[PDB]
Design a binder for this molecule. Structure first.
Ligand SMILES: CCC[C@H](CC)Oc1ccc(C(C)(C)C)cc1NC(=O)c1nnn(-c2cc(C)c(OC)cc2OC)c1C
Ligand SMILES: CCC[C@H](CC)Oc1ccc(C(C)(C)C)cc1NC(=O)c1nnn(-c2cc(C)c(OC)cc2OC)c1C
Lengths: 290, 292
């Protein structure tokens, strides 16, 4: 029941995802690893402890390096894995940039809207891709050679569910979405007309509605099970929740950067509030090829 | 009791051990660690694998912050992966031996020997004195060498507490730990091993034998005077039999080490001299370390 235009839209998004999502993370290299006023600290300390994870490094030889984080006592212990997660987030975003560049509807947009759209959807597209490698039964993001396993807590599943980011990943994983529905979610999140700095509001909004219409159609043709009733509205609701979480963790990120500077050059540009001159790295990447 | 000379003999060995055995391994730094991520050569390569599967351990590096890095060894895949922890264990050995060289130099009986005999004694006893020191930090309840922040936990070979006992090196450590020796008895074992008159290259065989006999008499007298007489009636002979077994183990692992060096060169310069890879001109590093 999909139109030819809609079939073409899903083919280009699926092709772009394949060409720009390093699911095995085999090209993620040269990352930092953990080495072998007062009220602001208390808020920040709660932020980081909510997402405590152990890092696992699998080698082609079969070896495994495992990092267990220190317990939450004293200060500057919570910042152990932050530099590594900053290097990982930066790598994920460079793939997000390449994802948008392949899309024809995005490439033809003005360079300032391209910068503004990626600046506003970076975290959201990054979390959507993390969800496709998230293992809900083990609480682990399986990123090829690297694995990020959630540390146990005293409250357990119920206490972790109080963290919105963690709750987003479990709820979205339970929808059992297809690759096409994720990539259409990524497109809908990317082409948001109400992002700060967008000038072609009407052009981006038209693009967004068509991506959403194509998602609604795809679900109607391939998801006749009763478990998938209202799946389109559920997905659209999850996308609205992710936008809310992005704001929370944009301010968390800025608090944590102030107390302790952990950001890469590209992440600092994304959080800097001439667009091209302020984002020189992002402008260069958008101009480069694949 | 013991003669005052035997008492001074123990006082000097304990003083030597105190100044040269870094029990916490705090000064063991800048070591290498495993990385983040033909027809008869096939024979020699086949022997090396068997040698490296006998003693499989996982490395734990505990941090000041409370973090725990842990390395699990790869299973054999017929490649360089089998030589993953050898660069680290070559830095560990070199670090331990330099403490052994320092141990012998503080002992007065060892300094008065000819330098060529000092080199010969250190060559034959370095593996034995290193394993004797390792046993004092070996926990048999968990199969782990507790080297300060570093831990080396033996891996379960599916026949744990039975398959590991086949390897004479592991059997040596479990058996020696069961004797529950004192610090003075450990240091006397080291002296008996160091002053072995039958090591290759020794020329003052009569002098070194006399010395070994007097350390052994001190050890026997120490056990008679400082332990319940009937229960430890044969503790001295048990210790001498463990030292005899360690000499046999030494010969076996000296060959293992030389075969592995032939295929994959991992040794440090000081270790290369120790394994033969004029005595003073063939061991110039060890010679300088003794002069200083
Ligand atoms: C395995 C991924 C899933 C889990 C998530 C719970 O990972 C972690 C696990 C643990 C930790 C701790 C640091 C240990 C608390 C953090 C993280 N996670 C991040 O550190 C992150 N996740 N996304 N981002 C991010 C990415 C981009 C492009 C961006 O551009 C505006 C802004 C961003 O943050 C505002 C970022 C920076
Ligand atoms: C805390 C110690 C760890 C455990 C404890 C037994 O051991 C291993 C456990 C595992 C491994 C593997 C590498 C994983 C196979 C090796 C080793 N062990 C060595 O790599 C060693 N242990 N001692 N030596 C050594 C030292 C000296 C001065 C020497 O001078 C002639 C000759 C030597 O070997 C011929 C050496 C070279």
């Amino acid at each position: 029941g999909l139109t030819e235009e809609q079939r073409m839209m899903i083919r280009e998004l699926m092709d772009a995802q394949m060409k720009t999502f390093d699911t095995t993370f085999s090209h993620f290299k040269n990352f930092r690893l953990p080495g072998v006023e007062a009220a602001k600290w208390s808020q920040v300390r709660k932020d980081l402890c909510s997402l405590k994870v152990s890092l696992q490094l699998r080698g082609e030889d079969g070896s495994v390096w495992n990092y267990k984080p220190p317990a939450d006592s004293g200060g500057k212990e919570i910042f152990s894995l932050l530099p590594h997660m900053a290097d990982m987030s930066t790598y994920m975003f460079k793939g997000i940039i390449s994802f948008a560049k392949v899309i024809s509807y995005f490439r033809d947009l003005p360079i300032e809207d391209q910068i503004s759209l990626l600046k506003g959807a970076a975290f959201e597209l990054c979390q959507l891709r993390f969800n496709t490698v998230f293992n809900a039964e083990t609480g682990t993001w399986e990123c090829g050679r690297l694995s990020y396993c959630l540390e146990d807590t005293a409250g357990g599943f119920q206490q972790l569910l109080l963290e919105p980011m963690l709750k987003f990943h479990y709820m979205l994983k339970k929808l059992q979405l297809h690759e096409e529905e994720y990539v259409l979610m990524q497109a809908i999140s990317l082409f948001s007309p109400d992002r700060p700095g967008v000038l072609q509001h009407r052009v981006v909004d038209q693009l967004q509605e068509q991506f959403a219409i194509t998602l609604k159609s795809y679900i109607e043709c391939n998801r006749p099970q009763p478990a998938h009733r209202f799946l389109f509205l559920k997905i659209m609701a999850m996308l609205t929740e992710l936008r809310s979480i992005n704001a929370q963790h944009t301010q968390r990120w800025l608090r944590i950067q102030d107390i302790h500077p952990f950001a890469t050059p590209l992440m600092q540009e994304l959080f800097g509030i001439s667009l091209t001159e302020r984002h020189k790295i992002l402008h260069r990447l958008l101009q480069e090829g694949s």
